[PDB]
């Protein structure tokens, strides 16, 4: 009854208005619906489910949906995208090198 640490979002490198894509071969993404970039955090950090471990995701806030990248704008073969009221959750020990 108080996820409190749980979420790990604030260990993600957050930007509004922004958005990533991807143009390697071995970068793909997820996404699903959702409500809040909070709720990603726990669907994102919860490894054993993402191919990447979850390196970086977003949130449309406009759309109230959930894209989960496997890099972060750093990474290679992407780029970065935006999306109006998309979110950017990069986590730091996952910045692509």
Same mark, same amino acid.
């Given at each position: 009854?108080?996820? *409190? &640490? &749980?979420?790990?979002?604030?260990?993600? *490198?957050?930007? /509004?208005?922004?958005?990533?894509?991807?143009?390697?071969?071995?970068?793909?993404?997820?996404?699903?619906? +959702? =409500?809040?970039?909070?709720? %990603? /955090?726990?669907?994102? @950090?919860? =490894?054993?489910?993402?191919? #990447? @471990? %979850?390196?970086? $995701?977003? $949130?449309?806030?406009?759309?109230?949906? %959930?894209?989960? #990248?496997?890099?972060?704008?750093?990474?290679?073969? +992407?780029?970065?995208? #935006?999306?109006?009221? #998309?979110?950017? !959750?990069? =986590?730091?020990? !996952?910045? &692509?090198?």
């Amino acid at each position: 009854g108080q996820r *409190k &640490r &749980r979420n790990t979002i604030h260990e993600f *490198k957050k930007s /509004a208005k922004t958005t990533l894509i991807k143009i390697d071969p071995a970068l793909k993404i997820k996404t699903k619906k +959702v =409500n809040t970039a909070d709720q %990603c /955090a726990n669907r994102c @950090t919860r =490894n054993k489910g993402l191919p #990447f @471990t %979850c390196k970086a $995701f977003v $949130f449309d806030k406009a759309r109230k949906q %959930c894209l989960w #990248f496997p890099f972060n704008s750093m990474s290679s073969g +992407v780029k970065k995208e #935006f999306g109006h009221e #998309f979110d950017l !959750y990069e =986590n730091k020990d !996952y910045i &692509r090198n």
